[PDB]
Amino acid sequence: GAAPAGGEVRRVTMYAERLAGGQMGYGLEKGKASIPGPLIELNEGDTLHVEFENTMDVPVSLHVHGLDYEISSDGTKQNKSHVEPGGTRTYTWRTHEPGRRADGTWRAGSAGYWHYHDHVVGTEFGTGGIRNGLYGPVIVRRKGDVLPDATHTIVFNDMTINNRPAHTGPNFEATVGDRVEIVMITHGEYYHTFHMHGHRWADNRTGMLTGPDDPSQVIDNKICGPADSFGFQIIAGEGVGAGAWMYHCHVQSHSDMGMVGLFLVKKPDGTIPGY
Amino acid sequence: AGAAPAGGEVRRVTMYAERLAGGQMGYGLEKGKASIPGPLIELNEGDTLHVEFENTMDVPVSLHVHGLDYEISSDGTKQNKSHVEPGGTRTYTWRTHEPGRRADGTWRAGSAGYWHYHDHVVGTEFGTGGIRNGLYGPVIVRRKGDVLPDATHTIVFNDMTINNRPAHTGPNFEATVGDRVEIVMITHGEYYHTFHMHGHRWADNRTGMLTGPDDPSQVIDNKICGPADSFGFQIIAGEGVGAGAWMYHCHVQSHSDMGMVGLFLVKKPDGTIPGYDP
Amino acid sequence: AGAAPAGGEVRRVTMYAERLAGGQMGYGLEKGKASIPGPLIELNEGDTLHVEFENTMDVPVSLHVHGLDYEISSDGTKQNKSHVEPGGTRTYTWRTHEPGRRADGTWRAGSAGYWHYHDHVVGTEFGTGGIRNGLYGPVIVRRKGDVLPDATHTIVFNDMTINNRPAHTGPNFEATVGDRVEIVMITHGEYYHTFHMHGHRWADNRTGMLTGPDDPSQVIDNKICGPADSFGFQIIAGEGVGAGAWMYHCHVQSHSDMGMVGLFLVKKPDGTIPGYDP
Ligand SMILES: [Cu+2]
Ligand SMILES: [Cu+2]
Ligand SMILES: [Cu+2]
Ligand SMILES: [Cu+2]
Ligand SMILES: [Cu+2]
Ligand SMILES: [Cu+2]
Ligand SMILES: [O]
């Protein structure tokens, strides 16, 4: 389980659809929109052509963080790269490996925990579409990056997690020992502090120290604001064992009002103690 | 300088939750000795700590810890039946570990860092009322080799207060030029803050100081922080700037205007402070 | 083009505080040419700056700097008798230093970084009124060997404004594809912000560039920031993405909706911007 060298041109169809009760979501297939939208992952060097269709009765767009795009795939009304109702457009995202420039400085690669979202619904900064649920995670991996057993996306969108009703999680299940990858994105109006019980991570690209010389901070509590994105991998229950491990925003009124879910770590027989 | 040793001791300490003057509540290591912030707990990586906990209050209370190892039975949440009924007792166990290699080739981070414990049960199932009342405290886990300070001070931005104190009442912390001073900085509650120190700066990393010339960590004097963030650092008091009454404060402008200010009082060897009135 | 030299020279500038139209206030290096942000001040580690300061206004004002070394007499605070009366003058003295090894074996962090200065006295004793009015500016301290830019631009999030400008009025900055553009980014006031740049990214470290393949610093295009935070980076204009009208904005949704947006206009060599249609 280690990511390869990138460099493939790949193609994906994507759709924007209305969901129940005023919401809106991205999907890989019509009738399959989700909140958050589909996970996209790539290897540094890959190119991705998103053959995008707006099935909605209002204009919509797709704007991505981190990845390379020319201005024609900005996905903004300002640069006239939104999609009209019933319309179709191909968005192109590219990625690159790190390397030394001609001027001698080091050019950072595209790898990271990134995300895409709408930019034109409600306002010309996508305020309505993001509130409605038009956001999704993008993982760009670097060659040799350790691959996880599972990937789970947690989005703090105003006072919700993934636009869900308060105090309804979501929960994620794992088994003690699993290598679990979390992708953490924030949207909207408020700052938050994402906290996990039982587990901790490095505040750097991959969430893991690169070895004994990495001076990165090891934390279990990270402040974050609109359009911030980070990720990390942990070994479930490592050093702490099985249980219902809570994650939540640590802003006191936010947890109290429902920004909480469970990381359910099972013992090899499936049981979870005290839960 | 003096350095932390390797860890591995199994330790035991009694702790109590007591009601304090003015609606407050605090932790302490001996009866009648609770404080806000609670007592500084110091461990070397690999140490174990058994907290024999006693709740002397009329409300359930708990003890939850950041960053350290613990099993689900020491979660300190009502959700996993780990709170302490009024008058009750419970042994909370925290463990730590050193960094090292896993079979998968990845590096496992250690427990070292600037952590903190708080209540999870008073007021709400997230300790909102308990934190407000003052049930928080710092925990430092040291890695083998860490430089040891001449003194450690704990600054906690709890909502609009520093350490639950009234506006414009510090706390003030005294040192002499040349002292190696360790700040532990915790934030709690509802609001974001930015911690700023006049005349001093630190590295935004684990220890607060650069490991050497190849360390790319940013050097700052202003750090945004939100509820349950904890970071720490060590500075040489007055290094390159001299003695005097050096302000620390939140840099959110209405927060400093309203009293989130204290004084780092750096003295000359003779104990005086140039241009300052006690 | 080129690289920062080793610092060490003693320097002089005159700085003025002036009233500006619309109730604003600004600093400048020459009378009648105050600006918001204030004039950019550049030093190399080890340089000393003597600022002969004149307050041309009818209320007290001060000059306080982040990051740099100063004695308590150059704190710029009323609290330490370091403000300037109406009509008065005062020499503020800033020092900087190189990184190095201390006697007790630890590494002293240098002064290099993206810093800033601002008033501490107009409105409140934390300069709440001066900062609102526009009394802030950038200070760069470079390390020996730092790459130098083609151009430097200062972007200041001051409450719900950029550089005290009306909503949706920029500023816009122009480059040519391939230009090495430095950004100095400073936040002031009451609110937290998230600084976002379309089509470009940087490392969240001191220089904003990874020191090499061993640098673990995060790469981002969105940084949370709060009052008195300062960071900076250098980017290659259009690098890997080309020409266009690339927006930068605050990504807090209502903040962008209500004005906190500008444009990084990157031009082809012939000077055109494809599909720029204002
Ligand atoms: Cu929150
Ligand atoms: Cu965005
Ligand atoms: Cu504050
Ligand atoms: Cu907590
Ligand atoms: Cu903003
Ligand atoms: Cu300041
Ligand atoms: O955006």
Numbering used by the authors:
A (entry chain C): 41 to 315
B (entry chain B), C (entry chain A): 40 to 317
Which text from the study accompanies this structure?
Laccases (benzenediol:oxygen oxidoreductases) are copper-containing enzymes that catalyze the oxidation of diverse compounds by molecular oxygen. The active center of laccases contains four copper ions: A blue (Cu1) mononuclear copper center (T1) and a trinuclear copper cluster (T2/T3); the latter consists of the mononuclear T2 copper ion (Cu2) and two T3 copper ions (Cu3α and Cu3β). T1 acts as a center for the reception of electrons from the reducing substrate, while the TNC serves as a binding site for the molecular oxygen and its reduction to water. Three-domain (3D) laccases are monomers consisting of three cupredoxin-type domains. two-domain (2D) laccases consist of two domains and exist as homotrimer, with the T2/T3 located at the interface of domain 2 and domain 1 of neighboring molecules, and T1 located near the surface of domain 2.
We considered that the replacement of the His165 (“gateway” of the proposed tunnel) to alanine could fix the tunnel in an open state, and the hydrophobic phenylalanine should close the tunnel. In the case of substitutions for phenylalanine (H165F and I170F), the tunnels were closed. His165Phelow Cu was obtained from an overproducer strain cultivated with 0.25 mM CuSO4. The structures of SgfSL, and its mutant forms with sufficient occupancy of copper ions, were obtained via the cultivation of the corresponding over-producer, the E. coli strain, in a medium with a high concentration of copper(II) sulfate (1 mM); in the case of cultivation with 0.25 mM CuSO4, the laccase crystal structures were deprived of copper. In line with our hypothesis, His165Phe variant showed drastically reduced turnover rates for ABTS; its catalytic efficiency decreased by a factor of 255 compared to SgfSL wt. We propose that shuttering the T3β tunnel in the His165Phe mutant may impede copper ion access to the TNC. This would explain why saturation of TNC with copper ions could only be reached at the increased (1 mM) copper content in the growth medium. The shuttering of the T3β tunnel likely impedes the access of dioxygen to the TNC, which would be in agreement with the fact that both His165Phe and His165Phelow Cu variants were inactive. Thus the Phe at the position 165 may hinder the access of both dioxygen and Cu ions to the TNC via the T3β tunnel.
